[PDB]
Amino acid sequence: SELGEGFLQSFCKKAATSFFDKYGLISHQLNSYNYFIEHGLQNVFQSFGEMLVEPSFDVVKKKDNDWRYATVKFGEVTVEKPTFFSDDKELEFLPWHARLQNMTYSARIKVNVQVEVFKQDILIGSIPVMVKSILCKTSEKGKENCKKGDCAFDQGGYFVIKGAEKVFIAQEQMCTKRLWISNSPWTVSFRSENKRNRFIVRLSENEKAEDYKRREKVLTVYFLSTEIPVWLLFFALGVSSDKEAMDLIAFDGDDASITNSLIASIHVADAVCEAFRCGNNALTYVEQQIKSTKFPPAESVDECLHLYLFPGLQSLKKKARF
Partner 1 sequence: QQVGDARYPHPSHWGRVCFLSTPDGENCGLVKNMSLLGLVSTQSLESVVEKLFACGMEELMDDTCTPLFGKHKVLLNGDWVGLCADSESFVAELKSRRRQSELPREMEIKRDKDDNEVRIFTDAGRLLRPLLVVENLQKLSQYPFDHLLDHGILELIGIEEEEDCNTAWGIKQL
Partner 2 sequence: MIIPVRCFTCGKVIGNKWDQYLDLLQLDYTEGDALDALQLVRYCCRRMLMTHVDLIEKLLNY
Partner 3 sequence: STMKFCRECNNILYPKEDKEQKILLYACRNCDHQEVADNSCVYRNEVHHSVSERTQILTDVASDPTLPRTKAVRCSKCQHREAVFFQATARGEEGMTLFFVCCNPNCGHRWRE
Mask of contacts with partner 3, 168-207, x by CB under 8 A?
---------------x------------------------
Mask of contacts with partner 2, 144-183, x by CB under 8 A?
---xx---x-------------------------------
Q: Is 216 in the site for partner 3 (CB under 8 A)?
A: no
Q: Is 2 in the site for partner 3 (CB under 8 A)?
A: no
| Shortest Å, Cβ 52 to partner 1 | 32
Q: Is 141 in the site for partner 2 (CB under 8 A)?
A: no
151 or 256: CB nearest partner 3 = 256
- Partner that binds at residue 312, options partner 3, partner 1, partner 2, none, CB closer than 5 to 8 Å by kind: partner 1
Window 220-279: residues binding partner 3 (CB under 8 A): 241-244, 254-257, 259-260, 262-263, 266, 270, 276-277
Angle at 182 between CA 177 and CA 188, to 5 degrees: 50
| Shortest Å, Cβ 300 to partner 1 | 22
Q: Is 280 in the site for partner 3 (CB under 8 A)?
A: no
13 or 148: CB nearest partner 2 = 148
Spell out the residues 6+ positions from residue 111 whose beta carbon is closer than 8 angstroms to its own. 45, 74, 75, 76, 77, 78, 121, 122, 124
Question: What CA dihedral angle connects 88, 92, 98 and 102, to 10 degrees?
Answer: -10
28 or 291: CB nearest partner 1 = 28
Can you give the chain as a three-state secondary structure string? CCCCHHHHHHHHHHHHHHHHHHCCCCCCCCCCCHHHHHHHHHHHCCCCCCCCECCCCCCCCCCCCCCCCEECCCCCCEECCCCCECCCCECCCCHHHHHCCCCCCEEEEEECCCCECCCCCEEEEEEECECCCCCCCCCCCCCCCCCCCCCCCCCCCCEECCCCEECCCCCCCCCCCCEEECCCCEEEEECCCCCCCCCEEEEEECCCCCCCCCCCEEEEEECCCCCEEHHHHHHHCCCCCCHHHCCCCCCCCCCCCHHHHHHHHHHHHHCCCCCCCCHHHHHHHHHHHHCCCCCCCCCCHHHHHHHCCCCCCCCCHHHCCC
| Shortest Å, Cβ 40 to partner 1 | 10
52 or 151: CB nearest partner 2 = 151
Q: Is 61 in the site for partner 2 (CB under 8 A)?
A: no
37 or 275: CB nearest partner 3 = 275
| Shortest Å, Cβ 30 to partner 1 | 11
Q: Please tell me the distance from the alpha carbon of residue 105 to that of residue 129, in angstroms, as a whole number.
A: 6
Q: Please tell me the distance from the alpha carbon of residue 219 to that of residue 205, in angstroms, as a whole number.
A: 9
Interface ranges with partner 1 (CB under 8 A): 1, 3, 5-6, 8-9, 11-12, 14-16, 18-19, 21-23, 27-28, 31-32, 35, 39, 169-173, 176-178, 238-239, 244, 247-248, 250, 312-313, 315, 317-318, 320-322
| Shortest Å, Cβ 147 to partner 2 | 5
147 or 291: CB nearest partner 2 = 147
108 or 319: CB nearest partner 1 = 319
19 or 48: CB nearest partner 1 = 19
